[PDB]
Structures are given as structure tokens and as C-alpha cells.
Amino acid sequence: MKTICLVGGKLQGFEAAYLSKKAGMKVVLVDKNPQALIRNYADEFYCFDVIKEPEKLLELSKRVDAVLPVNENLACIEFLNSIKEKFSCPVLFDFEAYRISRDKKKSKDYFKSIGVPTPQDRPSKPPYFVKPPCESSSVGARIIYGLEPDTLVEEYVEGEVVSLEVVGDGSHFAVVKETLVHIDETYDCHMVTPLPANPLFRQISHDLAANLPLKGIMDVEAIFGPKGLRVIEIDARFPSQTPTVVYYSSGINLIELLFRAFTDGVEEIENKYCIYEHLMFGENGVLIPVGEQVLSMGSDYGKFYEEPGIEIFLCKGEYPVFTMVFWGKDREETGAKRCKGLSVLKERFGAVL
Ligand SMILES: Nc1ncnc2c1ncn2[C@@H]1O[C@H](COP(=O)(O)OP(=O)(O)OP(=O)(O)O)[C@@H](O)[C@H]1O
Ligand SMILES: Nc1ncnc2c1ncn2[C@@H]1O[C@H](COP(=O)(O)OP(=O)(O)O)[C@@H](O)[C@H]1O
Ligand SMILES: NCCC[C@@H](N)C(=O)OP(=O)(O)O
Ligand SMILES: [Mg+2]
Ligand SMILES: [Mg+2]
């Protein structure tokens, strides 16, 4: 049995912990927040700030098999970079790739440098899509029909938002499984489903990783627009939501693949269906779809229910949020599991949907 140390206990942390458990790994969480979201989900919890007490993390590195940064605190990421040679286990991260990926303008420059289509900057005709240069979870992302002079202003590209994860070992780049990102009125993601292979998107994703070169994990987000595929962002860190759908639909565990990239290396290149979604239990049991932004305001997050083809996680807080995971051999069976999972909420908690 191996042990993984996660630095950060919110949504990235949950995803990493979930897949680590599927891999039969013990999960050690480090987080500066005594109320860290997944503190009770991890097998062990150590509450400290790694910047203030690096010696504690370095000591932990002696008794775990890998350390995985799962936060987007730049101060933390840059500090870990400065001490990474001191760890007694691999640090599963690509710091240079993250530096490019975190800055959306820098990323777009990179896309252009290798001939990858991306939305036109500063269009003359509405609607415009605007977003901060360095946020995630769709924070500050809005459609416009005096922003910071550093705000990204783009043409609005209509169509499917599609995600691909790539794990690189520096030499080989394993492009995994296409997923559909279902957006809400805030452009946050409330649902994820798998998609058939897209050879063009796979090649683009491969080339984005290969030209770095990627040693770590990165996802690629593209919109399948009316005039073709346009890559909107890359994020060189462990993502939330999509890796669960990747796991059920393809059989590939992204935590195991990432761990392999830093130990044995990786090789390039199941077909089930999966529905992943968040639902808030509102006033009087009204079920409301919500995005990640809502889930990250929670106070406690862990497993609520399981049966064959159904996993339900409960995020406690101001109005409970359920994360529902359904899988089966095809859309029909998975839809049947979704109904059963919903009816559990209906009969148990008097939920309405
Ligand atoms: N230096 C650090 N040491 C320990 N844990 C950290 C550190 N920096 C961030 N974290 C933890 O990682 C988790 C995710 O952090 P991140 O900054 O990516 O999301 P956030 O929602 O902006 O965090 P916060 O809850 O602080 O606003 C948080 O629970 C945070 O407490
Ligand atoms: N140019 C664009 N046109 C239309 N929608 C966009 C555009 N850029 C981003 N979006 C939408 O906003 C969401 C968040 O933007 P993204 O660039 O993927 O940032 P993040 O770092 O926040 O996840 C996307 O998933 C997509 O739904
Ligand atoms: N692989 C798509 C996962 C999307 C999302 N949950 C995420 O973690 O990244 P952002 O686009 O920065 O919000
Ligand atoms: Mg992003
Ligand atoms: Mg994004």
C-alpha cells in the first residue's frame, strides 16, 4: 500500500483523494484551514501552513510515497518550487508548465506560437467574453453585450466546452479521455459527461504537452465553435470533476497515471457512460443545479451513499450540496442509475426534482 500527501483540501484535494482511494492508497491531507473541506475524508489530517512550517512537510515527505500540490495559491506553489529539491519523495507537479498555464495571456501566446487556434483577442462587435487573467472555476468570467487593464477580452465562442487531460513524463504524453463540461448561467460547471474520441483535439492536446515538455498533469479546455475548435485555456495541475468521469468512462485512474509519470514513466494512448453532477438541496427540498463555486463554500465533504453504479457525496454547509456519480455500460443504464439515485434523495430527504 502506498501513501499520497495532498497539499490542499478543497475541490482539487477531494478529486485527488477520491481517485487515490480507488487506487487503494492512503490519503494524508495537509491544509492551513482547521475547517478544510475534505479533512474528514482524508485518512490523516495535519493542519499547518507549509510556507510557515516547511520542516513539517519535509518530515512528512519521508513517510509518504509522493506529495501532490492541489491548491492554486501562487505563494504556496512558488514556495514549494523553492524547496522541492529537499523532499524525500517525488513532488507530482510541473512548476514551469503551471507558470504558463495559470496566466491566460501567457497561455494564449503559447497557443499562437505553436499554431493552435484560440479565441480572437479584443473583438469589435458584441458579445465579448471577459475574464481575469489568473483565476479558475469561472471566477469573474462573464459575457458583455472600466475593467482592469489586465482583463482578457475575447470573442464569444458558442458551442460545447470540451476537456482533455494529458499526463506527461517529459518524453511520453498520454492523452486520456474527452469530457463535456456542462455550464450554468454563471459559466461554472455543474455537470460532466464523457465524449467520443476527437482526433484533432487529441493531437492538439498532445502537442501542447509535448512542446513544454510536460512532466506532470495538465488539462486542455476547448470550445467546439461554429468555425471550428478554439482552445480557451490549459491548467497544469490536478483538475476537479473530470477525472471522476474519466475514471468510469475509460477505466484510467489519473492519480495512478500521474504517479507513474514520476516513477516508471508513461506510455502514449473501457468505454462506459458516466453522469457526474452537483445538486443543491434548497429550501423545502427543492433540488437546484450548482457549480463548483458553490461546493467550495461548504464546511464538510464526504461520502453520503453508494450502491452499484451510484456514488453520492454530501457537502455540508449553508444548504447541503450533493455530488452525484452515476455509471453504466451505456447512456440508458446510466440514466436509470441517475433516476434511482434521485429517488433515494426523494424518498430519504423529501427532495423535489
Ligand atoms: N501554504 C498553504 N499551506 C497549507 N494549505 C494551503 C496553503 N495554501 C493553500 N492551502 C489550502 O489549499 C486549499 C485550496 O486553496 P486555493 O487557494 O486553491 O483555493 P481557495 O478557495 O482560493 O482557498 P481559500 O479557502 O484559502 O480561499 C485551501 O483549503 C487552502 O487552505
Ligand atoms: N471566449 C469564450 N467564449 C465563450 N465562452 C467562454 C470563453 N472563454 C471562457 N468561456 C466560458 O467560461 C468558462 C471559464 O473559462 P476558462 O477560460 O475555461 O477559465 P477557468 O480558469 O476559469 O476555468 C469556460 O468553461 C467557458 O464555459
Ligand atoms: N478538466 C475540466 C475541469 C474544469 C474545472 N473543474 C477545473 O478544475 O478547471 P477550470 O477550467 O480552471 O475551472
Ligand atoms: Mg482554468
Ligand atoms: Mg476554465
From Swiss-Prot:
Pathway: Amino-acid biosynthesis; L-pyrrolysine biosynthesis. Binds 2 magnesium ions per subunit. GO terms for biological process: pyrrolysine biosynthetic process. It catalyses: (3R)-3-methyl-D-ornithine + L-lysine + ATP = (3R)-3-methyl-D-ornithyl-N(6)-L-lysine + ADP + phosphate + H(+). Keywords: Amino-acid biosynthesis, ATP-binding, Ligase, Magnesium, Metal-binding, Nucleotide-binding. Pfam families: ATP-grasp_3, PylC-like_N. L-lysine binds at residues 11-12, 72, 240, 292. ATP binds at residues 10, 31, 49-50, 72-73. GO terms for cellular component: cytosol. Its cofactor is Mg(2+). It is an enzyme of class 6 (ligase). GO terms for molecular function: ATP binding; ligase activity; metal ion binding. Contains two adenine nucleotides bound at the active site. One ATP molecule is involved in catalysis, the second adenine nucleotide functions as a selective anchor for the C- and N-terminus of the Lys substrate and is responsible for protein stability. Is required for the biosynthesis of pyrrolysine. Catalyzes the ATP-dependent ligation between (3R)-3-methyl-D-ornithine and L-lysine, leading to (3R)-3-methyl-D-ornithyl-N6-L-lysine. This is 3-methyl-D-ornithine--L-lysine ligase.
